[PDB]
Coordinates of C-alpha atoms in Angstrom, one line a residue:
X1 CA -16.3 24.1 3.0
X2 CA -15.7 20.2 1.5
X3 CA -17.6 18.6 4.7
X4 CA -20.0 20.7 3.6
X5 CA -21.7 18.2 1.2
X6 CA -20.9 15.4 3.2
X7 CA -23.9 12.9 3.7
X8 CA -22.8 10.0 4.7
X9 CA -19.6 8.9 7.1
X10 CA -19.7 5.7 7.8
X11 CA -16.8 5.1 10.3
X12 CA -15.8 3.1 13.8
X13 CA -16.8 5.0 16.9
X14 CA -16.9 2.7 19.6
X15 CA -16.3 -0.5 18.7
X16 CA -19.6 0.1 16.9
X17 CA -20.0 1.3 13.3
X18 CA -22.0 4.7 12.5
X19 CA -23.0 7.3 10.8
X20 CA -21.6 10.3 11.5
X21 CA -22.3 12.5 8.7
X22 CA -25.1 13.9 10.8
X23 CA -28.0 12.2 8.9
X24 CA -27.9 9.7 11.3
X25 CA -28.4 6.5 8.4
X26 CA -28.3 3.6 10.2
X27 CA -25.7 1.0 10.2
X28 CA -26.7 -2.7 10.7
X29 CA -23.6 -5.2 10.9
X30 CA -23.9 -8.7 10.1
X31 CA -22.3 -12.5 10.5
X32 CA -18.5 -11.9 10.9
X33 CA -17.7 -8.4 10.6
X34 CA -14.3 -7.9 12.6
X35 CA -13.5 -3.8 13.5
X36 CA -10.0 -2.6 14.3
X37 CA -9.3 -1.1 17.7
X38 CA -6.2 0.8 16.4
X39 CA -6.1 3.3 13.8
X40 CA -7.6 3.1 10.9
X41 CA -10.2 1.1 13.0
X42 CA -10.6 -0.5 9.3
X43 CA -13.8 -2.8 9.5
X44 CA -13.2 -6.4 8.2
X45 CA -14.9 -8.9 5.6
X46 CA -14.3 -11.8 4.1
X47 CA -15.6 -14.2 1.2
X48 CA -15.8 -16.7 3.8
X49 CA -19.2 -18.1 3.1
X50 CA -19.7 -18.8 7.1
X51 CA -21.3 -16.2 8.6
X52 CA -20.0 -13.9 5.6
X53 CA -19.6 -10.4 7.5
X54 CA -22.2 -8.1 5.9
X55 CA -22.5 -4.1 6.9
X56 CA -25.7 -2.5 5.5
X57 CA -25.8 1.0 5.7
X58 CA -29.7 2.4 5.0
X59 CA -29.8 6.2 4.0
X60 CA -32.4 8.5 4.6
X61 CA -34.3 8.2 1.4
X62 CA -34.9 12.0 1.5
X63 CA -31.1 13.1 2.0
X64 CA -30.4 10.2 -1.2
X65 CA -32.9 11.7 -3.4
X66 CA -32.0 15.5 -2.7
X67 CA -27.9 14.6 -3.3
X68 CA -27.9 11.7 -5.8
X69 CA -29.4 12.9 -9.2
X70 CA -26.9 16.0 -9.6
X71 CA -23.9 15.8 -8.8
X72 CA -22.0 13.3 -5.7
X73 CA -18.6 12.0 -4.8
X74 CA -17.9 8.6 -2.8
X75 CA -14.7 8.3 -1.6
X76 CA -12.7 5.4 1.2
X77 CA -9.8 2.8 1.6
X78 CA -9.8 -0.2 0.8
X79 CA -7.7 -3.5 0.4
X80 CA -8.3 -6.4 -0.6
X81 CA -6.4 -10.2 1.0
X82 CA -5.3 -11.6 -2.0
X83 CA -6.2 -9.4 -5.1
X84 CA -4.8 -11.8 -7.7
X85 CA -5.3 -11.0 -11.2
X86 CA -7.4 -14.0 -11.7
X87 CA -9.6 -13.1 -9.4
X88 CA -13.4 -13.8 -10.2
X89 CA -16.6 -11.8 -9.8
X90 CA -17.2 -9.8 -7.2
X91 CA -19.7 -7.4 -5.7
X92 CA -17.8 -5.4 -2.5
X93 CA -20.2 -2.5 -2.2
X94 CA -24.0 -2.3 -3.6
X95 CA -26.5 0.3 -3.9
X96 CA -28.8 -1.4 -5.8
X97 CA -32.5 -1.7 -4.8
X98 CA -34.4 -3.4 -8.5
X99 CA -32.3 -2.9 -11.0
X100 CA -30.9 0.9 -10.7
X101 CA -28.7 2.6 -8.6
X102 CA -24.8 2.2 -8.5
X103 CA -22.8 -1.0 -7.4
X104 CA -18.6 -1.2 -7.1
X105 CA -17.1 -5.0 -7.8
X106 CA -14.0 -6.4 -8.0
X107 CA -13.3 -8.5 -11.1
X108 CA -9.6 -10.0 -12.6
X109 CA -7.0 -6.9 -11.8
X110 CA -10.2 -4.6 -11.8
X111 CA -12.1 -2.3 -9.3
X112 CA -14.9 -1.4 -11.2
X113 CA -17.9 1.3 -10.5
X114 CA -21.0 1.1 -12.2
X115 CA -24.4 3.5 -12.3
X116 CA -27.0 1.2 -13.1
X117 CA -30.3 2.8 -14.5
X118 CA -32.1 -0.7 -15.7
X119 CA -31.3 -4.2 -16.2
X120 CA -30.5 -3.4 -19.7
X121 CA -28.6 -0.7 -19.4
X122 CA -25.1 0.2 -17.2
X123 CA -22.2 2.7 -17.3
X124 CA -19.2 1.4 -15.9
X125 CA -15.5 2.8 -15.2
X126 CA -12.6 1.0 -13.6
X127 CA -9.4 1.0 -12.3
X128 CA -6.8 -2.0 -13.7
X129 CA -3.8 -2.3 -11.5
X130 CA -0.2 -3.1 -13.2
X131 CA 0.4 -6.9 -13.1
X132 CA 4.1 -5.9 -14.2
X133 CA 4.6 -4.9 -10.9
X134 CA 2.1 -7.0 -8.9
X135 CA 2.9 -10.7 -9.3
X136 CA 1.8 -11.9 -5.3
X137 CA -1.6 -10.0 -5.8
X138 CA -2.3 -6.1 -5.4
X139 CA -2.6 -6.2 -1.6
X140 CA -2.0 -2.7 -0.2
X141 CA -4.5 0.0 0.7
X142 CA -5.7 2.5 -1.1
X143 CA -7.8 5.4 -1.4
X144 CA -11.0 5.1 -3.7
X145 CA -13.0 8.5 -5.1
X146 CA -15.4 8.0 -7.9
X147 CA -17.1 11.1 -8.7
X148 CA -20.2 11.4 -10.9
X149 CA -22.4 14.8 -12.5
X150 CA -24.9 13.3 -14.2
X151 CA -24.6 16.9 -16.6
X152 CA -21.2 16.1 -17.3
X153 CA -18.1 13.5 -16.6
X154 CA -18.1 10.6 -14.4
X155 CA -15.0 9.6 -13.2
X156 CA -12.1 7.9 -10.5
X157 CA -9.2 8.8 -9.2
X158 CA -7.2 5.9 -6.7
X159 CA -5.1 7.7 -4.5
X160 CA -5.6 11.1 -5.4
X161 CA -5.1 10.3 -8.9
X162 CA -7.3 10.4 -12.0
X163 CA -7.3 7.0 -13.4
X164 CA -10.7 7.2 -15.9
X165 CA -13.0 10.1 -16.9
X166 CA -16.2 9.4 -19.1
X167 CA -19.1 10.9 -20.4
X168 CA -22.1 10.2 -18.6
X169 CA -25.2 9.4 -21.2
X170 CA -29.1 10.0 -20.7
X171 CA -29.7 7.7 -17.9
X172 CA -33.1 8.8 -17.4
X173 CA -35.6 6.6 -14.9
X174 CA -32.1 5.6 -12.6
X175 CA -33.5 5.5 -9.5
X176 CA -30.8 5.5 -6.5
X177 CA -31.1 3.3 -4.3
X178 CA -30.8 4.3 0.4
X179 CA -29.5 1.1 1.0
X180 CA -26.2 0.4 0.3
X181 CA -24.4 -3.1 1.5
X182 CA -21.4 -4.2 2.2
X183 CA -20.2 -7.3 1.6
X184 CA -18.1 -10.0 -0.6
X185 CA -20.0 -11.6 -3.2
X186 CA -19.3 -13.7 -6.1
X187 CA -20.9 -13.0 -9.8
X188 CA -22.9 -15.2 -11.2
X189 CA -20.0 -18.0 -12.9
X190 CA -19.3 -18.5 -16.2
X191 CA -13.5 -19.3 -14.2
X192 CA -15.5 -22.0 -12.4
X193 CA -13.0 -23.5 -9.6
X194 CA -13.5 -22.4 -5.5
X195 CA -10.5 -20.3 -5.4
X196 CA -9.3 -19.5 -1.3
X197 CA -11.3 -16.3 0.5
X198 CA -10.2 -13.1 0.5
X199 CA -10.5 -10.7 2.9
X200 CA -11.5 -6.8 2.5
X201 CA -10.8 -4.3 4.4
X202 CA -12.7 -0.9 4.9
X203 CA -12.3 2.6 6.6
X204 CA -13.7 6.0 6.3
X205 CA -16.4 5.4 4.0
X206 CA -18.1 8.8 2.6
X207 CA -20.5 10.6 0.5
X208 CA -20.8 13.8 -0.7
X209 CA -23.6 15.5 -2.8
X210 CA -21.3 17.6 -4.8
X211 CA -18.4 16.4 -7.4
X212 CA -15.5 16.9 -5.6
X213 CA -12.4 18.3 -8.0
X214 CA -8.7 17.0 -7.8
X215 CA -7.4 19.1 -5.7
X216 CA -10.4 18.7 -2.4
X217 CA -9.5 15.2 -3.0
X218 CA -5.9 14.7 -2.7
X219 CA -6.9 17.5 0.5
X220 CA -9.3 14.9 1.7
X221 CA -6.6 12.1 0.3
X222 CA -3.9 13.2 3.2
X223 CA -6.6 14.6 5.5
X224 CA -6.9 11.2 7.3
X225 CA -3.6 9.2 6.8
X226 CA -0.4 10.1 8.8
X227 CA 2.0 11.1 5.9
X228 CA 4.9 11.4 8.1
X229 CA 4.7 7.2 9.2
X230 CA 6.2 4.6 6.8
X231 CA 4.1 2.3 5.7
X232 CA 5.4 -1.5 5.0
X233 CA 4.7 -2.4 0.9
X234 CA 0.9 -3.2 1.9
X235 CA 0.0 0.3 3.4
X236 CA 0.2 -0.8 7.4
X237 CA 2.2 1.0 9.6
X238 CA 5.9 0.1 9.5
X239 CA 7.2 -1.3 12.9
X240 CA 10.5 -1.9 14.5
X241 CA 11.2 -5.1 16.1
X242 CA 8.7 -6.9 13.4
X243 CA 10.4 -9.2 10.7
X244 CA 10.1 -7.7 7.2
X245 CA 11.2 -8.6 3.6
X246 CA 13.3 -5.8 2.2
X247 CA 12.7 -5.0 -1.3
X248 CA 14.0 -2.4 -3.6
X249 CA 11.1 -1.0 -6.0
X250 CA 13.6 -1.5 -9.0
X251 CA 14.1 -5.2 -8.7
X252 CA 11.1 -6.7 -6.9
X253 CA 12.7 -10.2 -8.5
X254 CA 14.7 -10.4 -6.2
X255 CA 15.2 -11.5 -2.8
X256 CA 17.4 -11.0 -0.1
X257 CA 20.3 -13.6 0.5
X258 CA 24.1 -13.2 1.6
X259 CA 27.3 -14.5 0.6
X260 CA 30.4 -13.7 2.6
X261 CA 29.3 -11.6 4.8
X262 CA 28.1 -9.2 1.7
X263 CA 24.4 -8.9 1.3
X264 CA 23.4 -9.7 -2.5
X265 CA 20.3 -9.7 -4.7
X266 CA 18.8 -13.3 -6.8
X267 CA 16.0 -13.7 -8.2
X268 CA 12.9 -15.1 -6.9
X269 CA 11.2 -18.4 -8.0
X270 CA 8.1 -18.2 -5.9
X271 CA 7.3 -15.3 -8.3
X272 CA 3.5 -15.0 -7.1
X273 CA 4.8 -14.6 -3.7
X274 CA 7.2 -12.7 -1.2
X275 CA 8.3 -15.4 0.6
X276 CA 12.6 -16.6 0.1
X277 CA 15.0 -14.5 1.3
X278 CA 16.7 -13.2 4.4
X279 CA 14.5 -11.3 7.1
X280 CA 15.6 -8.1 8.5
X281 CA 14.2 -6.0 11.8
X282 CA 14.3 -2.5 11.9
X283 CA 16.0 -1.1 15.6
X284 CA 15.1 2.5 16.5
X285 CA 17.7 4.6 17.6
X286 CA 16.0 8.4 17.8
X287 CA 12.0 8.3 17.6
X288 CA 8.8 8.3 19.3
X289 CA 9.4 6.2 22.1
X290 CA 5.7 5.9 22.9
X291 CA 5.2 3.7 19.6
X292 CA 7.0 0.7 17.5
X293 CA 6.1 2.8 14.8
X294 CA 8.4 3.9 12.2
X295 CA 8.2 7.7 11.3
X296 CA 10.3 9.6 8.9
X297 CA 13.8 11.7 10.4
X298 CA 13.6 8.4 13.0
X299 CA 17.6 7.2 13.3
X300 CA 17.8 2.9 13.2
X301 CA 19.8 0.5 12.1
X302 CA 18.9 -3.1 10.8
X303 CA 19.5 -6.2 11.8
X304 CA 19.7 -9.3 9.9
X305 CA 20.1 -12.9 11.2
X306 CA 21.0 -15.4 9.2
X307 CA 22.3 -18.8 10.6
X308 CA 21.1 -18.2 14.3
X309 CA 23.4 -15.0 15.1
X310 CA 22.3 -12.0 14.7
X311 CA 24.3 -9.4 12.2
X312 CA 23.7 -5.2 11.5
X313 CA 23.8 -4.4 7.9
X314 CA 26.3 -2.2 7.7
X315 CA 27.7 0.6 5.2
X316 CA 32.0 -1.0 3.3
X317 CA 35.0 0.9 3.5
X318 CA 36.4 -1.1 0.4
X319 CA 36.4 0.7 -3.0
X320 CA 33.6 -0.8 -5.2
X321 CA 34.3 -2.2 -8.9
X322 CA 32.1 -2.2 -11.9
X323 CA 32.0 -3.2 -15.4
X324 CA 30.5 0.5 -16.9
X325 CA 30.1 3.6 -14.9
X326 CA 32.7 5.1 -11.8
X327 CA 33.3 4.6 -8.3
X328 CA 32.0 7.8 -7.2
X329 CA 31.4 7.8 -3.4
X330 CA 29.6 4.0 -4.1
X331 CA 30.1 1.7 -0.5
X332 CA 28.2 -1.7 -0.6
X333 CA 26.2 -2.9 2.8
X334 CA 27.7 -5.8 4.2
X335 CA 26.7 -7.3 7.6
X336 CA 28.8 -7.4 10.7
X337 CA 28.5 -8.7 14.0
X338 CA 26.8 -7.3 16.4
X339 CA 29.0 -5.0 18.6
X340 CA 26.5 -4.5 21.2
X341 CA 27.7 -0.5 20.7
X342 CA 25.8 1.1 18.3
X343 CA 28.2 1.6 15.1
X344 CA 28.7 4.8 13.0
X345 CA 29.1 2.3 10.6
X346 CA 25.2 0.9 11.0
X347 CA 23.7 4.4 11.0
X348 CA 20.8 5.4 8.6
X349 CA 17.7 7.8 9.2
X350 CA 14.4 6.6 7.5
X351 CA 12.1 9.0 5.8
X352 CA 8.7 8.1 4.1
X353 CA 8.6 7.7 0.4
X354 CA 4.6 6.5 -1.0
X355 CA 3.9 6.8 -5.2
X356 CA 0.6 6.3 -6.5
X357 CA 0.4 2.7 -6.7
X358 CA 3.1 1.5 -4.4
X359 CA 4.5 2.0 -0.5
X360 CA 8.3 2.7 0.1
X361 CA 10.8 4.9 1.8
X362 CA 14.4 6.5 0.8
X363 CA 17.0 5.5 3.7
X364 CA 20.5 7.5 3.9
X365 CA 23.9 7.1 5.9
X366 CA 23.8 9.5 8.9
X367 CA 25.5 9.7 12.2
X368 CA 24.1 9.4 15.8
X369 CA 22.0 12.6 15.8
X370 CA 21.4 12.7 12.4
X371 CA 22.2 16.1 11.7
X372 CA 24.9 15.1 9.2
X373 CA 23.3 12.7 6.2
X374 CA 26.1 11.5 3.8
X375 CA 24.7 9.8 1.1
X376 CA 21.8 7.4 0.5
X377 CA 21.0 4.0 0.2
X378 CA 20.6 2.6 -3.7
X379 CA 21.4 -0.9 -5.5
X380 CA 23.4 -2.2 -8.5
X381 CA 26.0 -4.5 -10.2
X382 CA 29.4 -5.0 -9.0
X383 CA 32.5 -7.4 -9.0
X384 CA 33.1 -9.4 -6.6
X385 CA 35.3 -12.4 -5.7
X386 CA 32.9 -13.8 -2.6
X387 CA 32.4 -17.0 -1.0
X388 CA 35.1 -19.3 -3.0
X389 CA 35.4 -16.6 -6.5
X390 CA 39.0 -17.0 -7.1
X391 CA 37.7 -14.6 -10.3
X392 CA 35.9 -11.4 -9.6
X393 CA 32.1 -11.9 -10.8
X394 CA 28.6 -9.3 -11.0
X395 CA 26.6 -8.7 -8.4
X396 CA 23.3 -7.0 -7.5
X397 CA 23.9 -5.5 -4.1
X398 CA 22.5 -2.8 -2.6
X399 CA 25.0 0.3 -1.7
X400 CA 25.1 3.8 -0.5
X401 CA 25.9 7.0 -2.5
X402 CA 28.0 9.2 -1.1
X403 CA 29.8 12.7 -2.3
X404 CA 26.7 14.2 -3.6
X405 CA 23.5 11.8 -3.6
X406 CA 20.8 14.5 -4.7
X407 CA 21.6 13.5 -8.1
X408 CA 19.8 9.8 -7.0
X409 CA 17.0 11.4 -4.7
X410 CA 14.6 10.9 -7.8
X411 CA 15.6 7.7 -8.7
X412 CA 13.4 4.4 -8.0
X413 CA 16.3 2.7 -7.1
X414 CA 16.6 4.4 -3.8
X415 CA 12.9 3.3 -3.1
X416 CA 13.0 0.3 -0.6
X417 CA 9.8 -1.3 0.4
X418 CA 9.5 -3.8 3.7
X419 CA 7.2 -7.2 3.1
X420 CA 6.4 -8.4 6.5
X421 CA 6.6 -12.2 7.0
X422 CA 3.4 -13.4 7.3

């Protein structure tokens, strides 16, 4: 019944990009536009300058002026390379023949969509990501849905969420506009330095001549995305035997490092950037053998190597101190040496863990078949007398709830997200 007002469906059939909507608009791809042969088959541009890769995707006029003027809904995923919040002009998608129809840019922290009826005269509505929380760029998928009844509210929601709403005003004489193209392109200066390109990335692009309501879109929202597979911090698959930078959503300050033999927690100084710290690699134990894909009940075990050897993270035995709260069932994760014989002691199933504007995944403490879970995995401040302390001191370390962890299940300090090492 929702597919029923689709009108447009722009997506990667071959190795070719189409309509298949079943209006047959046609699809006419540009300079260096690179296609993904593996799911999402995500289509690729860039601000290059080159060849700039530049899709135009040209409507039949009649479908456009029969679905436009009422109410529509235009819905996708994106991501963008490096989405800064510095970030200058941009124009990523236009429908804009003259100087009406609609147009989506990308400005400092903002995705921004606009209905343009003349060249004096807009209506915008964005979506401002949290800087707070994004200091190397907002660089992870996600889903788009602006929806727009010219009788009514205009709004968009990113990843199934409502993010504005607005009145929409008289915007008599808008005339939409059957092409619409994609491509990178900077607004006209004011900033004024040639900042490095960034790339965007594209899948499942569609159109629908009805306003679409929360709940057909967060149905649409998990309609085309594998729930069940983590995905690392930027929204791609998450793989095993693939170097990653493991994060906890609490303390994204931080990086990974080790003392003796105990992994701890310091702060970053490459703040705009995920690089520092120790690398781990996620080893599958139980799982889909036909993939290197990560999916949620999977049974693994990390590995992190540090000098040139090669250690497991690992859950203590030793009771844990701390200045405030109790020792309830609290272990830290330490590394050991490899035993080349999979250790109880190393154990954890994975499960998927996404929130609106981030990608992470809640790891617990389970045995070989994982059909006993113990606890789950968490992070905070403890003494220690480590590498040389003759005197106990704090520190940050991530640990593993035990007894009865469903008290933590809802806590963001359970959240872990994986980097991967560019």
């Amino acid at each position: 019944n929702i597919n029923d007002s689709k009108i447009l469906s722009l997506q990667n059939r071959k190795n070719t990009l189409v309509d298949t909507s079943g209006y047959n608009a046609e699809v006419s791809e540009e300079g260096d536009v690179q296609l993904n042969p593996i799911f999402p088959f995500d289509f690729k541009l860039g601000s290059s300058g080159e060849d700039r890769g530049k899709v135009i995707v040209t409507q039949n006029e009649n479908i456009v002026y029969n679905s436009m003027y009422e109410s529509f809904s235009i819905s996708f995923w994106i991501r963008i390379n490096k989405w800064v919040s510095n970030l200058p002009g941009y124009t990523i998608i236009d429908s804009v023949k003259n100087n009406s129809g609609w147009s989506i840019g990308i400005i400092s922290n903002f995705l921004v969509f606009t209905l343009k009826q003349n060249e004096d005269s807009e209506q915008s509505i964005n979506f401002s990501y949290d800087i707070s929380n994004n200091a190397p760029g907002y660089n992870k998928w996600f889903f788009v849905t602006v929806t727009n009844n010219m009788m009514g509210n205009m709004k968009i929601y990113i990843n199934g969420k409502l993010i504005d709403t607005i009145k929409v005003k008289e915007l008599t004489g808008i005339n939409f506009s059957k092409t619409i193209t994609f491509e990178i392109n900077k607004i006209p200066d004011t900033i004024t330095s040639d900042s490095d390109n960034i790339n965007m990335w594209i899948r499942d692009f569609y159109i629908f001549a009805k306003e679409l309501d929360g709940k057909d879109i967060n149905i649409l929202f998990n309609s085309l995305q594998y729930t069940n597979v983590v995905k690392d911090y930027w929204g791609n698959d998450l793989r095993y035997n693939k170097e990653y930078y493991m994060v906890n959503i609490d303390y994204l300050n931080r990086y990974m490092y080790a003392n003796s033999r105990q992994i701890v927690f310091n702060t970053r100084r490459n703040n705009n950037d995920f690089n520092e710290g120790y690398k781990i690699i996620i080893k599958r134990i139980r799982g889909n053998t036909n993939d290197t894909r990560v999916r949620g009940g999977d049974i693994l075990y990390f590995d992190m190597t540090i000098n040139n050897k090669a250690y497991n993270l690992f859950m203590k035995n030793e009771t844990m101190y701390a200045d405030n709260h109790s020792t309830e069932d609290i272990y830290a994760i330490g590394l050991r040496e490899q035993t080349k014989d999979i250790n109880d002691n190393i154990i954890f199933q994975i499960q998927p863990m996404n929130n609106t504007y981030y990608y992470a995944s809640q790891i617990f403490k389970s045995n070989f078949n994982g059909e006993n879970i113990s606890g789950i995995c968490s992070i905070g401040t403890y003494r220690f007398r480590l590498g040389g302390d003759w005197y106990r001191h704090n520190y940050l370390v991530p640990t593993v709830k035990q007894g009865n962890y469903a008290s933590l299940l809802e806590s963001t300090s359970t959240h872990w997200g994986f980097v991967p090492v560019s």
